[PDB]
């Protein structure tokens, strides 16, 4: 089938790195380092990359089994994948599908099992966020159960986040500074030098906002585009899909952009951080080579 | 475009009444009263009913403005709709789009504003769950702010839920002991007497499970099907779409069912509550009239 994108406005779509509606659309050419996001990554031909979950709703969800009974507000889980199979550290994955792919001081959560007295809240402290090792230690856990051997499923709800730039810093998934053995999706770098990554932004709930209160986490593809690629049998006939971003109510063509086949969008001619209207729709035009030069925004 | 459904397995899709992956698929013929869900409602031609949000990720999200500074762990919010427009409580809508459409003792939440000391947790007690009035009183609010006139955005994360049957009991949205002035989408009723509603189930996190720990909330359509109908220009050439539910790996056809044009699925010949495998895909077969009688499961 010929390539297309869903006829949804940006503000009708969802982040693929934090479950929430998209709220901003912007290009920032002065970010310190290129992002290496592990969620929200998919090729145009429908190949998921990194820890990107195939089920949209497994983003920020987790499943596991308690390794010991709760004591001293500590719950340790051996981690499973969304399919219920055991997560195998030896596979090279940094974490089960859908796990957070950025640095934070705390990851706040809620969880429950299928038996009584297992609904609780807690958090994973940064030093304990080492899912590549096969488990996570949940602290400040406020339920009396579970006992050992009980399946738990939960949701990461918010983060302790003192510094917004840490959304673009991968966590120490294996508890060390050395990620060489991990099978990580590659950094996102525009192919032409004047191009700037187009960021789809949303607002997560965070604590530790005393220094500066604005929190924005970006992703490369709206979740609805990822699902679109999974539900169509597209062939990437060129290096990039040339798209137009159009306000369908007002007719105004806002800009053209390139959706590279590895799954990210760029615009040209951005010299300072630039925000774009949210009520537009992205429409496919044609396939273009990597060095196709876009009209500046 | 000819009618189709996305090629996702049931366990690869999401509930449209609680944000979480689908976990069960079942038909219960012994539910005495038909459900009147206000979320997860969409015709095959892509027209939303009830409070069903156009953006998948606005389910269980809310936004508004504080009417007073926080005091005594109470935060009162005047509600907005998802698009930031003011929710007019005189209009007859039961709630802003995406608000929970069932009865619970407490609706647990988290929220935050643009300024520091506004990230908190709290809850809406059942007696305060009257969003049709244009606002909600949040209690057990644990942040020191916001002051008055401050925008807040938040998420419903879990419920206090004594009885699973209350997932199918609409709440008293206007606090008037159900007076019938509200604009509600109609009950979901199979058009033939031998048919049973096919329920797409997920597990929300709930408290008050000490006595019966299993909690399952059902919906009429996976969220991904609703988005599919919004992103295609379908014309229902019949009263109902005949579907086959097939395990694509083994090729095993499990049952046939009818997807009625108003947006729900039924099976035939179910005499006891019956669960079905989650690894199947619903495939469109043809259009059939309302009187078409399905092969029994």
Author numbering:
A (entry chain A), B (entry chain B): 226 to 522
What does the paper say about this structure?
Noroviruses are highly contagious, infecting both humans and animals. The human norovirus capsid protruding (P) domain binds histo-blood group antigen (HBGA) co-factors for infection, and a recently discovered bat norovirus (GX) was also found to interact with HBGAs. In this study, we determined the P domain structures of four human noroviruses and one bat norovirus using X-ray crystallography to examine structural features linked to potential interspecies transmission. The principal structural difference was a variable length P2 subdomain loop (Loop A), which was located near the HBGA pocket.
The P domains of GII.9 (AY038599), GII.23 (KT290889), GII.27 (MG495077), GVIII (AJ844470), and GX (MF373609) were expressed in E.coli. The five P domains were structurally equivalent with a root mean square deviation for C-alpha atoms ranging between 0.586 Å (GII.23-GII.27) and 1.645 Å (GII.9-GX). These two equivalent residues were lacking in the GVIII and GX P domains; however, an aspartic acid (D367) was located nearby in the GX P domain. The cross-reactivity of the P domains was determined using direct ELISA with a broad-spectrum human norovirus Nanobody (Fc-NB26) that binds to a highly conserved region on the P domain. The GVIII P domain also had many Fc-NB26-binding residues, while most Fc-NB26-binding residues were absent in GX. Subsequently, the bat norovirus could be considered antigenically distinct from human GII noroviruses. In addition, the bat norovirus HBGA-binding site may be shifted from the regular GII HBGA pocket, as observed in other genogroups.
